[PDB]
Coordinates of C-alpha atoms and ligand atoms in Angstrom, one line a residue:
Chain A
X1 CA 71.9 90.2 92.9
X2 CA 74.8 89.6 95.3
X3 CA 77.4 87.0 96.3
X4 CA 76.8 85.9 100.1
X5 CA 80.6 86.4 102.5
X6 CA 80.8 84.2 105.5
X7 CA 82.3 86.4 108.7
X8 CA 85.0 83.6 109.0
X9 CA 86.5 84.4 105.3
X10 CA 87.1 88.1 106.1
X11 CA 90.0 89.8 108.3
X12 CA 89.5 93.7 109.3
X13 CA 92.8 95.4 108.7
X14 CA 93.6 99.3 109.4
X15 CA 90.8 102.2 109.1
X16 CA 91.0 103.9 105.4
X17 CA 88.1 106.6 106.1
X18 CA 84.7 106.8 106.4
X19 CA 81.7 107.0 103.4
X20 CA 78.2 108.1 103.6
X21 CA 77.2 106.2 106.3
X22 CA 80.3 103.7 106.1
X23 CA 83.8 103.3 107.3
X24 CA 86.4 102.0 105.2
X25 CA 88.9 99.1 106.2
X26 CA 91.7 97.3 104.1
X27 CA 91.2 93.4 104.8
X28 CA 91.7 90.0 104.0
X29 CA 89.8 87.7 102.2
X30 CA 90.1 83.5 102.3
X31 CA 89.9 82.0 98.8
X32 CA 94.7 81.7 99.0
X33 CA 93.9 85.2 100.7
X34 CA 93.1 88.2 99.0
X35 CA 93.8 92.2 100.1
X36 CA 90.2 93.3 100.0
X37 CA 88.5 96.9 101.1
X38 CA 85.8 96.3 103.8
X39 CA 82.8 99.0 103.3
X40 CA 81.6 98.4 107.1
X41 CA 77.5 99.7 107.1
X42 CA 76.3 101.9 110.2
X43 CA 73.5 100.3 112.5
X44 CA 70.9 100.9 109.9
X45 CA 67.1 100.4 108.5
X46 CA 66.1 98.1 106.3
X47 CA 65.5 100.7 103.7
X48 CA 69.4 102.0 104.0
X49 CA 70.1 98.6 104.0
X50 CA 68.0 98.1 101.2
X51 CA 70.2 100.6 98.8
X52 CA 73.4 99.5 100.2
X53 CA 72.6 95.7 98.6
X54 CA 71.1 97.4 95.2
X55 CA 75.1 99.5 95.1
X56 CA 76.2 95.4 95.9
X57 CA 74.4 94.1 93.2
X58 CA 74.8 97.1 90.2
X59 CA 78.7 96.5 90.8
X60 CA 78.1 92.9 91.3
X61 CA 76.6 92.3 88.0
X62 CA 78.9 94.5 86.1
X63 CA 82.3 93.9 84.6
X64 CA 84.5 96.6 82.7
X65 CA 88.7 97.0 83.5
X66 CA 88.0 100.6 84.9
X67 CA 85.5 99.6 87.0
X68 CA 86.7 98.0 90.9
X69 CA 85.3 94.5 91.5
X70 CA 82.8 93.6 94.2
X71 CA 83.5 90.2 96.1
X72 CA 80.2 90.0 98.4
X73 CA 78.2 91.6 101.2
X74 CA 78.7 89.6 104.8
X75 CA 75.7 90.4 107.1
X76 CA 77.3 90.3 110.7
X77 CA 74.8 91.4 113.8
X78 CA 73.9 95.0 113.4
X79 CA 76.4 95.4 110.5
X80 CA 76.5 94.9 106.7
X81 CA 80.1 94.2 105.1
X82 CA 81.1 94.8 101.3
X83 CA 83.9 93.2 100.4
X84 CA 85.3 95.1 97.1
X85 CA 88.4 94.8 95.4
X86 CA 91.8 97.0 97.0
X87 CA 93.4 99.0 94.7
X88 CA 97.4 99.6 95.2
X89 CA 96.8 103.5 95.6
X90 CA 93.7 104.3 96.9
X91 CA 91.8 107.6 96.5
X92 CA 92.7 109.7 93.3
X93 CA 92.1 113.2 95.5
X94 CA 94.2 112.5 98.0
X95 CA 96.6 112.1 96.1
X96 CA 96.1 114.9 93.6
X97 CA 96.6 117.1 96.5
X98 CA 99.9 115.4 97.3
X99 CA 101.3 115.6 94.1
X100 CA 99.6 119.6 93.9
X101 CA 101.5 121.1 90.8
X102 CA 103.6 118.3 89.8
X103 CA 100.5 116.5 88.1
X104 CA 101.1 116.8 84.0
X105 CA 97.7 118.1 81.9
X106 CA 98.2 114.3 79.6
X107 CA 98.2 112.7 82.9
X108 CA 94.6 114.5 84.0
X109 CA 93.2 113.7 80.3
X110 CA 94.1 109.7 80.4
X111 CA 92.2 110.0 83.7
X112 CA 89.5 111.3 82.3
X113 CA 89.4 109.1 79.2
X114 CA 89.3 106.3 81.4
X115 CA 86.6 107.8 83.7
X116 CA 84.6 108.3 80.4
X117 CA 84.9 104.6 79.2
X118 CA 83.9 103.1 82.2
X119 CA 81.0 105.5 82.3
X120 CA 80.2 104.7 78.8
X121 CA 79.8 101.3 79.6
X122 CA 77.4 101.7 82.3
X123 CA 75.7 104.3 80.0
X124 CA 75.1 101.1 77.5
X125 CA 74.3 99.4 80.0
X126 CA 71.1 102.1 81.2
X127 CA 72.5 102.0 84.7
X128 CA 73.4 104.9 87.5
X129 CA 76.6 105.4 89.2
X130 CA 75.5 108.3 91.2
X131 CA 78.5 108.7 93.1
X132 CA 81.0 110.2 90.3
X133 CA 83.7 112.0 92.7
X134 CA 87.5 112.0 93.0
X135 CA 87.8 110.4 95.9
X136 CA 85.6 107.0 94.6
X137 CA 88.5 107.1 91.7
X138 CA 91.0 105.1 92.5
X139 CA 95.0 104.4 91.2
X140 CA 95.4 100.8 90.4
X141 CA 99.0 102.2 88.6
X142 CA 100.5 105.4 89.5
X143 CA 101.7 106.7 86.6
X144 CA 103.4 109.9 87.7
X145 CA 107.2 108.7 86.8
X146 CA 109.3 108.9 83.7
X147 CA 107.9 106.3 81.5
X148 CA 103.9 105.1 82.9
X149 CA 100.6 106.2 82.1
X150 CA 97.6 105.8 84.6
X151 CA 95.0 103.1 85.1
X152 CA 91.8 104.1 87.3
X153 CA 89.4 102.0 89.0
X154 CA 85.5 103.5 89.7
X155 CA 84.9 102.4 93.4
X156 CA 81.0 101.3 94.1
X157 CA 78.9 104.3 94.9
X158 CA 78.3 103.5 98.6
X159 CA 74.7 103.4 100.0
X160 CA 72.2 104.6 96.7
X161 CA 71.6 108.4 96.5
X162 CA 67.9 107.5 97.0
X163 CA 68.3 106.7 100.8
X164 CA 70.4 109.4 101.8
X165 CA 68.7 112.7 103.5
X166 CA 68.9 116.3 102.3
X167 CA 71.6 117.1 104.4
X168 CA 73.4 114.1 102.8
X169 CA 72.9 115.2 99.4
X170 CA 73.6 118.7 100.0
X171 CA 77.2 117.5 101.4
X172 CA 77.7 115.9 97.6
X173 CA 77.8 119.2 96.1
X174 CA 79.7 120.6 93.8
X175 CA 79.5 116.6 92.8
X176 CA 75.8 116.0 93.3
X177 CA 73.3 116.7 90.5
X178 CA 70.9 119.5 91.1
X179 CA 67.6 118.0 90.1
X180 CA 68.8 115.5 93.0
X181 CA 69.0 118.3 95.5
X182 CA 64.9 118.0 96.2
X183 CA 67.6 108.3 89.5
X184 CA 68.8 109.3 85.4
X185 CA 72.1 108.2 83.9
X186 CA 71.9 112.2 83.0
X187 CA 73.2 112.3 86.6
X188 CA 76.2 111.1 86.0
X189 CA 77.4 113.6 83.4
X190 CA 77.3 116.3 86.1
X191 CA 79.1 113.9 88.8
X192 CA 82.1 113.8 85.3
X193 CA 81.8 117.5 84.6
X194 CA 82.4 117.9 89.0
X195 CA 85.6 115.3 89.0
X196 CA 86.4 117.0 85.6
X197 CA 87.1 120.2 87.3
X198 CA 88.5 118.6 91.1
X199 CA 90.9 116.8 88.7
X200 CA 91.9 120.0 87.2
X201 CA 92.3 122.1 90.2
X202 CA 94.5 119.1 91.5
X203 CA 92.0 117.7 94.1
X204 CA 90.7 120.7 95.1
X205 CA 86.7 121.1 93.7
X206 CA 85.1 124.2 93.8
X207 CA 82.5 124.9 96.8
X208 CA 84.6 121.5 99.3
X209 CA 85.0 124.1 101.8
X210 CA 82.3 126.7 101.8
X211 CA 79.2 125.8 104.4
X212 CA 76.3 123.3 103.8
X213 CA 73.9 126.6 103.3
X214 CA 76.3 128.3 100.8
X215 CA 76.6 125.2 98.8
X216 CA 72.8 125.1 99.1
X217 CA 72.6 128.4 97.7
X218 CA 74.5 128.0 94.8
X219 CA 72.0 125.4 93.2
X220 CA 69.2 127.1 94.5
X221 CA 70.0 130.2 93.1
X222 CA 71.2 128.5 89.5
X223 CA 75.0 129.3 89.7
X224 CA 77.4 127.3 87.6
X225 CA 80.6 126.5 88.4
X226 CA 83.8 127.9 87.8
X227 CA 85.4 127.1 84.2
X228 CA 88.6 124.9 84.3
X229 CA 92.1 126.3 84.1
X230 CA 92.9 123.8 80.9
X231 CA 90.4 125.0 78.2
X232 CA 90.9 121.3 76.6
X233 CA 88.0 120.6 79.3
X234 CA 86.2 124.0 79.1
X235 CA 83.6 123.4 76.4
X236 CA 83.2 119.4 77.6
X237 CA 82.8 120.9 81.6
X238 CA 80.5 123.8 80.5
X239 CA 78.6 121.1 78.3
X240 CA 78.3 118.8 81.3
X241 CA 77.2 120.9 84.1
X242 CA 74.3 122.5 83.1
X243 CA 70.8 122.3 85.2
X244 CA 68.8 121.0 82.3
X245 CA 69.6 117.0 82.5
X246 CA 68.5 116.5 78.8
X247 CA 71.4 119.1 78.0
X248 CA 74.4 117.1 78.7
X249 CA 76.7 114.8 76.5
X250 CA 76.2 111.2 76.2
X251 CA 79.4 109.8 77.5
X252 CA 79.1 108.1 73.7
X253 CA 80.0 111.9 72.5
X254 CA 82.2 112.5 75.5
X255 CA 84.5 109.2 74.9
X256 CA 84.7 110.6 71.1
X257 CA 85.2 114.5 72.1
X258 CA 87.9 113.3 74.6
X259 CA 89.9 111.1 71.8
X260 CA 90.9 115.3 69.7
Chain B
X1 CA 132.4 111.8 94.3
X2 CA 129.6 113.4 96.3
X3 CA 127.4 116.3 95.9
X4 CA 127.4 119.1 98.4
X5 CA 124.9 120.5 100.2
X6 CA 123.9 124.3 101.9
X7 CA 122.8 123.7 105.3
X8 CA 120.1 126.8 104.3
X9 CA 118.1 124.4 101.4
X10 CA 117.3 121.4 104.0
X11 CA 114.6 121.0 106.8
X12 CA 114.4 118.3 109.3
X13 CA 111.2 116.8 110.2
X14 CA 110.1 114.0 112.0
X15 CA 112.9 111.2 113.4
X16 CA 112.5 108.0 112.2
X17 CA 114.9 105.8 113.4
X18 CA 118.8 105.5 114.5
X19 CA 121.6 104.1 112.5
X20 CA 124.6 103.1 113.3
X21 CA 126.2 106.7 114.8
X22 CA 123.2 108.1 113.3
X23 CA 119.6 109.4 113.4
X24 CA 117.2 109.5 110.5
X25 CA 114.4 111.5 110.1
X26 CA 112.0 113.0 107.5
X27 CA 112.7 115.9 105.3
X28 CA 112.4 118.8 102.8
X29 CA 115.2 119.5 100.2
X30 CA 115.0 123.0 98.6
X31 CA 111.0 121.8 98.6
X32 CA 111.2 117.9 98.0
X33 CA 111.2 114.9 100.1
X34 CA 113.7 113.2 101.3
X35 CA 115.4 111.4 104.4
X36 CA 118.2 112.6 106.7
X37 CA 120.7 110.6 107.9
X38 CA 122.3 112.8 110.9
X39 CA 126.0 111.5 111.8
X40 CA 126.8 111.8 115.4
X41 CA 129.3 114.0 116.9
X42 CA 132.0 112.0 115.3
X43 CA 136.3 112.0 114.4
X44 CA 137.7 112.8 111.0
X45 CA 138.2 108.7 110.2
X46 CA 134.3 108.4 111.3
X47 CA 133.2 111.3 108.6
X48 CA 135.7 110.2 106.0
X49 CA 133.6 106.4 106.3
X50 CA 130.2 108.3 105.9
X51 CA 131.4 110.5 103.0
X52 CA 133.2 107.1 101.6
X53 CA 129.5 105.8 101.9
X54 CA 127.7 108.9 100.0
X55 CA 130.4 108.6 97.1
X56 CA 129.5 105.0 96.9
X57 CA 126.1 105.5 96.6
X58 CA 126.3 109.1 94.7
X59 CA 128.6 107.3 91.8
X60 CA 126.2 104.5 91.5
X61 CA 122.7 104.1 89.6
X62 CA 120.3 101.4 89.7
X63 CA 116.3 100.6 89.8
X64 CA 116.7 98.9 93.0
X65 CA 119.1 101.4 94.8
X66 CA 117.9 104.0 96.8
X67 CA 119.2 108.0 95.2
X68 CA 121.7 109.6 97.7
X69 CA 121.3 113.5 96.5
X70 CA 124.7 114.4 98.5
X71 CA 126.0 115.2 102.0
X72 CA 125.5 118.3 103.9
X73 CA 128.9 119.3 105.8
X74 CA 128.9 122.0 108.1
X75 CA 131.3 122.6 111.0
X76 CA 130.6 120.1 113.7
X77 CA 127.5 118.5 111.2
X78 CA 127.6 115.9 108.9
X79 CA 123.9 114.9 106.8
X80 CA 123.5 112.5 104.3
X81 CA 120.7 113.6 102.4
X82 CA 118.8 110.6 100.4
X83 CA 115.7 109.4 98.5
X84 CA 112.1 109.4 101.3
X85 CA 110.9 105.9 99.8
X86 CA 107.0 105.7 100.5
X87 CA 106.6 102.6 103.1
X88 CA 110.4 102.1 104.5
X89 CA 112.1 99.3 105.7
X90 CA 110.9 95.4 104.5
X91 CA 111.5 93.9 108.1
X92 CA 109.1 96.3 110.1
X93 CA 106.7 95.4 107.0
X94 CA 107.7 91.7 107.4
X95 CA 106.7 91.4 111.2
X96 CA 103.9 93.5 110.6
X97 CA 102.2 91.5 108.1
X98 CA 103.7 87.8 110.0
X99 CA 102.3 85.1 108.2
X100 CA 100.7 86.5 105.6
X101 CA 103.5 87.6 103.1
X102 CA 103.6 84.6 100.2
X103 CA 106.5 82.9 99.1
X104 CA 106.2 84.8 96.1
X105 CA 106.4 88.0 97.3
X106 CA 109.7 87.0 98.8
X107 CA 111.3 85.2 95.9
X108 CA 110.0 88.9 94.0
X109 CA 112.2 90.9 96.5
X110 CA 115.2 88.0 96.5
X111 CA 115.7 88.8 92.4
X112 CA 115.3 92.3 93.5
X113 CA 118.1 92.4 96.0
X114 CA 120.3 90.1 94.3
X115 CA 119.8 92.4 90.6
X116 CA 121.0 95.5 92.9
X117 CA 124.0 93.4 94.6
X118 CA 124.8 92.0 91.4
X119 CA 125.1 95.5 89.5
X120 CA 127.7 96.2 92.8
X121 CA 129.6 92.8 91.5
X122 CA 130.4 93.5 87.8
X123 CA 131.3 97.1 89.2
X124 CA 133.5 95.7 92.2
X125 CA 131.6 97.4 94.8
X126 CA 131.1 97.0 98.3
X127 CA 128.0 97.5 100.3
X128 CA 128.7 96.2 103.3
X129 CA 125.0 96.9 105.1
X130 CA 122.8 94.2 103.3
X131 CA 119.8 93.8 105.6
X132 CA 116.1 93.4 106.1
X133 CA 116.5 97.6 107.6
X134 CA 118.2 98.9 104.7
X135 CA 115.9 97.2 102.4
X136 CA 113.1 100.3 101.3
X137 CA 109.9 98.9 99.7
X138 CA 109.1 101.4 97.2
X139 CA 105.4 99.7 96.5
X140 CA 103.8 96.9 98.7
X141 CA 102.6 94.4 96.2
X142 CA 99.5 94.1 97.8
X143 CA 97.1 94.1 95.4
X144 CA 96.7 91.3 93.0
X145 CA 98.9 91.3 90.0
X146 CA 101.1 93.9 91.7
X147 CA 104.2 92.5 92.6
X148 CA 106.7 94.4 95.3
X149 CA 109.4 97.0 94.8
X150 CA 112.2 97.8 96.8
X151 CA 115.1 100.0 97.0
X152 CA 118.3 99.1 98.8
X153 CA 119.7 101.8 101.0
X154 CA 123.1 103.7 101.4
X155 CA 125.1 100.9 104.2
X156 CA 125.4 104.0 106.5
X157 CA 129.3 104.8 108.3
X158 CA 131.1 102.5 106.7
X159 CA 132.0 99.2 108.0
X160 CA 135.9 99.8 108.8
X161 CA 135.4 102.3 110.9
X162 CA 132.9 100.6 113.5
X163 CA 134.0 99.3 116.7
X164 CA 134.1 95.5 117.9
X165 CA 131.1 96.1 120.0
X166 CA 129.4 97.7 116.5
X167 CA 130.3 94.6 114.5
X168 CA 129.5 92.3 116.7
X169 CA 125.7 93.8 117.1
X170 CA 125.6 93.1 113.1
X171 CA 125.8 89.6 113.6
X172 CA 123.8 87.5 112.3
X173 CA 123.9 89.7 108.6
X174 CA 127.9 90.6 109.4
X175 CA 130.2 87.9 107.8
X176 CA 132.5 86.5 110.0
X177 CA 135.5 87.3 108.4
X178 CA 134.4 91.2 109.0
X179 CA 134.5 90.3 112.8
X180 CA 138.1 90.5 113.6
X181 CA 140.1 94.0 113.1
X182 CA 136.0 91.8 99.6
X183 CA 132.5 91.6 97.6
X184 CA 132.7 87.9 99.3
X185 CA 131.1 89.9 102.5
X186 CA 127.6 90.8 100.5
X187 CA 127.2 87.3 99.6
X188 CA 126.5 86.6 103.5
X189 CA 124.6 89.7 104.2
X190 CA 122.5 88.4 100.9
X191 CA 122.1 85.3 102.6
X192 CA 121.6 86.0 106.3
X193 CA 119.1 88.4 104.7
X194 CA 116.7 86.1 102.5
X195 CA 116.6 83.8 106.4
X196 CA 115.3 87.1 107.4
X197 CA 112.5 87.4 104.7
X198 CA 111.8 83.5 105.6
X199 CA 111.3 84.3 109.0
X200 CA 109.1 87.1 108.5
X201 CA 111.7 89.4 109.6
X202 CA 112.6 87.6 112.6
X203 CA 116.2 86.9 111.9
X204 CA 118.9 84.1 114.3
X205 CA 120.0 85.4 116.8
X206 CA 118.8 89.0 116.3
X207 CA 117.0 88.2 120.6
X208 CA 120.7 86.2 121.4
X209 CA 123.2 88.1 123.7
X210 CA 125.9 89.7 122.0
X211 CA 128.6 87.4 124.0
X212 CA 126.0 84.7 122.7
X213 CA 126.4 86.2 119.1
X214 CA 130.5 86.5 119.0
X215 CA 130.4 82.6 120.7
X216 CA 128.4 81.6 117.4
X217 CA 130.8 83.1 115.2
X218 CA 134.3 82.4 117.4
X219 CA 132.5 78.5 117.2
X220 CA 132.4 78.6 113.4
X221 CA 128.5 77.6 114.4
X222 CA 125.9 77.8 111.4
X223 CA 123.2 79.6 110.9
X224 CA 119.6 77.9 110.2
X225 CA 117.7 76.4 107.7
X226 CA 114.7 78.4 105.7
X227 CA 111.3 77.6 106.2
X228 CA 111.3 76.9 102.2
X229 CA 113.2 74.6 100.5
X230 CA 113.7 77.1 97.8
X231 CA 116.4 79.0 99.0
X232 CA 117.9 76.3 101.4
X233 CA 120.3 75.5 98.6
X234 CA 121.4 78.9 97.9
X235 CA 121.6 80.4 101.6
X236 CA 123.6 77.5 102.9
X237 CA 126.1 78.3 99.6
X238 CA 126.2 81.9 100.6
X239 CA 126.1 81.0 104.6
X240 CA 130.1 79.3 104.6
X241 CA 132.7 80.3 106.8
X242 CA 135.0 80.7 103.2
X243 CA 135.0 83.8 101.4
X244 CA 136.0 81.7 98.0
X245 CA 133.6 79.5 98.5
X246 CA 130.5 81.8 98.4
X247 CA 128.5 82.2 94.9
X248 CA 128.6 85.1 92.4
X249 CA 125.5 87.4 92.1
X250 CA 125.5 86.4 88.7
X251 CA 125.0 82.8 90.1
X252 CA 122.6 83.4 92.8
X253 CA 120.6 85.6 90.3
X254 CA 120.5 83.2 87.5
X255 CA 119.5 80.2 90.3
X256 CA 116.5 82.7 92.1
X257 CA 114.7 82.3 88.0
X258 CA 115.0 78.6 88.1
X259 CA 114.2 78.0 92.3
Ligands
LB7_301 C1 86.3 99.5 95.8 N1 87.6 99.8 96.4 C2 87.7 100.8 97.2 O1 86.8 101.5 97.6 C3 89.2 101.1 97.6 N2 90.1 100.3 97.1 N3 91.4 100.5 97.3 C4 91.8 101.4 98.1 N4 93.2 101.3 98.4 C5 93.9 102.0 99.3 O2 93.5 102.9 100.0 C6 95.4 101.6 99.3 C7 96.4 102.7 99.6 C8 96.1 101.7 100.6 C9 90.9 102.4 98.7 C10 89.6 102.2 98.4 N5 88.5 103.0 99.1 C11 88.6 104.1 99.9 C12 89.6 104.4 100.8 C13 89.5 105.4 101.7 C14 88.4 106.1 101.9 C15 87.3 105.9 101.0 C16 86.1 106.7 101.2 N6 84.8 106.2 100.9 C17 84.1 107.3 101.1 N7 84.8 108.3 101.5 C18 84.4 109.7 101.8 N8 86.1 108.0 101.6 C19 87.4 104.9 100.0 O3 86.4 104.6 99.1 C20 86.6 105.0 97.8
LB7_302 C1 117.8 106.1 101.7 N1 116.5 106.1 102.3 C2 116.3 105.5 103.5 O1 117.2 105.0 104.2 C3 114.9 105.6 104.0 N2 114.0 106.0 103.1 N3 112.6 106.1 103.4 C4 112.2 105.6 104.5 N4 110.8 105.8 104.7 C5 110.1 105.6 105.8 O2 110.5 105.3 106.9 C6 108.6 105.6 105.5 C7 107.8 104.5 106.0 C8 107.7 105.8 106.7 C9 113.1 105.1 105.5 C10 114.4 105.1 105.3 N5 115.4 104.9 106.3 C11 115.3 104.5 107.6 C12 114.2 104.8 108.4 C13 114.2 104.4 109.8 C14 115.3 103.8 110.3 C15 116.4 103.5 109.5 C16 117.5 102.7 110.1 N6 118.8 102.8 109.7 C17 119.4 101.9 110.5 N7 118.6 101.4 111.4 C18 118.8 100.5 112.6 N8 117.3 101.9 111.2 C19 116.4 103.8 108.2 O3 117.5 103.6 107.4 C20 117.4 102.4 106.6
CL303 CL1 102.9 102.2 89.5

């Protein structure tokens, strides 16, 4: 399970964004104090609840250097609190689209090295992510300057895909797996092959802006998605995001593949 | 010297603050970002001190010195065109995170500021500026194991060309031999500086009139104590009266790795 937060220990700090059925503040936490990241739960039903506390205890009962660190769930009135670790840099999209064209191929493939071994590990493990997206990768170091390489952090997967309602899951596309559109670790090698190509296309996935019945469409009617501009990726991308789960890489081979 | 630069490759965005004769604001070098610092409508000697200030800065390089990419002179314009660092000045940081900055953190930025004031030392160079507003944190240090980063900025229109009234508004950071009409002056703005950082940039007598601030200095009065005994030692060394008797950099940096 879960460690257990008093609402005395934790400070709400500014607003960072908003999740599937969460909003994100930077905090405090009494230990000595700590700069945490609050994941602040809507009013909700026990059964949202429910998958919120299973997300809680996956990254809970977890350790691996590429993965963030969960410090608790505090269960104030009509709200749930996850307390999780803050990362200097936040979000890897955001600022992929900052940095647009000044974001070295190397740069993209230690990312993605270290997206794969954390993966890897959870793939070991027999457990799901299901929430493999740029925007839950996050920049402990920078590593755009003269001299520094990156080092991620995979942010918990919010409130379990299980929960959320179509129109949710439709909203996760390109990242979402389509046998989820109507939970196996297969998932998770689409959600890679997705960030794969948002990586490449410097924060910008394919399908982000078209409309939720467009997105629809394009699993519905079998399309794949576009190839990646660095063919380095192309045959581990193609490989990835195909619509039969049993078809795609372990991250075993991936981890290896990614190392030539 | 100091680089030119074409009025056509910059583009002013949004104003950030006011310097001393100056306003700075966001902007886009031809298309990179950087900071503008706009001198007033201003005399030769006035210009000749802000282009005194670019050279300084432009024939300089150090980790914990902010980039000055070169000046921008046309007509009745003068711009100094500088490195945009990410999260600006330390004492608008300081007061915004009051009582929750560890000692750490500031004896991280004291080796910081004194390396960069130190480099100005065994170069014989004068800054002039040292305070919490000119200090530019680079990266926070927020998150556990990460430690801060700053970047000390250019010290604006230089000091001999201000006025009384200008001077005297830079007191408590001025030294007071800078008051009437040397790398000795640094050594106070270094120390008047880490009482800022103490105080979680709430510096003495920053509130005080300034009749109230040239009485402290005319009365050879003294300047407070830090919070920590760390630094007590080594800001009431820098915090004298006599030039001669302030500390090296070389000192001061060599006594910040042992308290
Ligand atoms: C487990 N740790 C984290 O989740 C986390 N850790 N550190 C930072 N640091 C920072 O931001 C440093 C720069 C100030 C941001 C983080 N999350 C984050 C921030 C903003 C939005 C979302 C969010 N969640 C869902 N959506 C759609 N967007 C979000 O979740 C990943
Ligand atoms: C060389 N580079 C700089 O000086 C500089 N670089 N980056 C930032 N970034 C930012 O602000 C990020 C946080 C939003 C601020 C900077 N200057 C700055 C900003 C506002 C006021 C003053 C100022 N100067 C004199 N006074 C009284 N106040 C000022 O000069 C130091
Ligand atoms: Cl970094």
């Amino acid at each position: 399970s879960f460690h257990r937060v008093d609402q005395k220990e934790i400070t709400q700090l500014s607003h960072l964004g908003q999740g599937t059925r969460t909003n994100v503040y930077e905090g405090r936490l009494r230990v000595q104090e700590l700069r945490v990241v609050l994941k602040v739960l809507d009013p909700s039903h026990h059964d949202i609840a429910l998958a919120f506390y299973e997300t809680a205890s996956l990254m809970s009962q977890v350790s691996h250097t590429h993965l963030a660190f969960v410090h608790g769930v505090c269960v104030r009135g009509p709200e749930n609190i996850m307390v999780t670790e803050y990362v200097e840099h936040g979000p890897l999209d955001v600022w992929l689209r900052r940095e647009r064209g000044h974001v070295p191929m190397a740069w993209k493939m230690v990312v993605a090295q270290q997206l794969a071994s954390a993966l890897s590990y959870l793939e070991n493990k027999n457990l799901v992510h299901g929430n493999v997206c740029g925007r839950n990768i996050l920049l402990a170091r920078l590593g755009l300057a003269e001299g520094t390489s990156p080092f991620i952090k995979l942010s918990d997967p919010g409130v379990g895909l299980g929960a959320l309602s179509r129109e949710e899951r439709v909203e996760r596309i390109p990242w979402l797996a389509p046998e989820c559109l109507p939970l196996s670790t297969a998932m998770d090698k689409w959600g890679f092959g997705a960030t794969l190509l948002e990586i490449c296309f410097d924060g910008e996935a394919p399908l982000q802006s078209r409309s939720p019945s467009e997105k629809e469409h394009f699993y519905q009617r079998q399309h794949r998605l576009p190839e990646p501009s660095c063919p380095q990726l192309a045959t581990l991308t193609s490989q990835c995001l195909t619509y039969e789960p049993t078809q795609r890489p372990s991250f075993r081979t991936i981890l290896r593949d990614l190392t030539r």
